[PDB]
Amino acid sequence: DIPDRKEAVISLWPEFAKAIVSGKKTVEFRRRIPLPALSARIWIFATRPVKSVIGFAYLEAIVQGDVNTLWSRYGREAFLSEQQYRDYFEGTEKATAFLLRDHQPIRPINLDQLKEIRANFQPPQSLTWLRKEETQKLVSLTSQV
């Protein structure tokens, strides 16, 4: 359940979301964010115009470091451009990197479907923990692409 932090949802722009579930993007950079447990399943919500859960991946490592060293070490796996990285971290010296593995694309679970699982679902700005029952219903709708 939620205290275990094994099931979470994050939101990504469509080109980055699709890059995670295809395995091209294996690092996700964040500022301050609740940290999941290791081996947590991270469901990928793709924002407008897709507005759907389109896959998931598993968290294999959490890195916390300084902005410039993380770009050097992990920027190529993170898919975004250097300008987009500097924009996002403008105003802090600290960065967090999620290292992901075992990406799995699924048939999109659209917004109305997610609203049956969670009445007031909104795309998380950072990360939202899934309740046991919420994870159950989500798994019940997972199908191959």
Numbering used by the authors: 3 to 147
What text does the study give?
Thr49, Arg50, Lys53, and Gln127 directly interact with atoms of the phosphate backbone, while Tyr47 forms an interaction with the phosphate moiety between the −1 and +1 nucleotides through the intervening water molecules. However, removal of the side-chain hydroxyl group in Tyr47 (Y47F) substantially decreased the DNA- and RNA-binding activity of the protein. In addition, this Y47F mutant also possessed decreased RNA-hydrolytic activity. Mutations of the two independent residues at the positions of 47 and 128 did not make a noticeable structural change. There are two and four protein molecules in the asymmetric unit of the trigonal and monoclinic crystal forms, respectively. The conformations of individual monomers are in excellent agreement, and all monomers superimpose with RMSD values of less than 0.3 Å, with the largest deviations in the loops between strands β2 and β3 and helices α4 and α5.
